[PDB]
Homo-oligomer: A and B are copies of this chain.
Amino acid sequence: AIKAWTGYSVSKWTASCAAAEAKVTSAITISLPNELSSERNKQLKVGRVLLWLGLLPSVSGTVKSCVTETQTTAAASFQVALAVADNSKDVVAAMYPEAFKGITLEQLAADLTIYLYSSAALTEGDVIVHLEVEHVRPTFDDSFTPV
């Protein structure tokens, strides 16, 4: 498997798709994990992003998803996507990686967002949208307070 750079680090989380009618593009918002939620960590720099997708077997249609800046109408977002994850492939992935170097981890919570499309309708949680983020290593204080 792929390795992060020296001085970089990995974390992973999850979100579930909202129910939606066919051909509609839905939107999903990135919320940070608790391990990074403090004001010390939000100012770290992103190094790579790796969207991923997995699905329960009764979903029959095409399914596509991507990471972009937030686009003012949801469906249009794919038109600037530097790659698209796609259940028509053998492997349903979209490793960028170069898209977001030097962006603050705050900004990856602020306005980068995840979009999802299916040619058939979805019920809640029919799709699970993993995400993986590789970023500058978090640090904890090396010493107690003074007395």
A binding-site residues for B, Cβ under 8 Å? 1-4, 8-12, 23, 25, 33-38, 40-41, 50, 52, 54-58, 62, 64, 75-76, 78-83, 91, 93, 95-98, 117, 119, 125, 128, 130, 132, 134, 137-138, 140-147
Contact = CB atoms under 8 A, between A and B. Distances in A.
A9 B40 CA distance: 15
Nearest to A91: B147
Interface of A is mostly: loop
A80 B62 CA distance: 19
Given A4-B142, A145-B2, A33 B23 contact: no
B56 A75 contact: yes
Contacts of A75: 56-58
A83 B11 contact: no
Contacts of A132: 144-145
Contacts of A4: 142-144
Nearest to A96: B146
A76 B145 contact: no
Contacts of A3: 142-144
Most buried by B among A40, A54, A128: A54
28 contacts: A1-B97, A1-B144, A1-B145, A1-B146, A1-B147, A2-B143, A4-B144, A9-B140, A9-B141, A10-B143, A12-B145, A23-B58, A33-B34, A34-B35, A35-B38, A35-B40, A35-B140, A50-B144, A52-B147, A54-B78, A56-B76, A57-B117, A57-B119, A76-B125, A79-B128, A93-B147, A95-B147, A132-B144
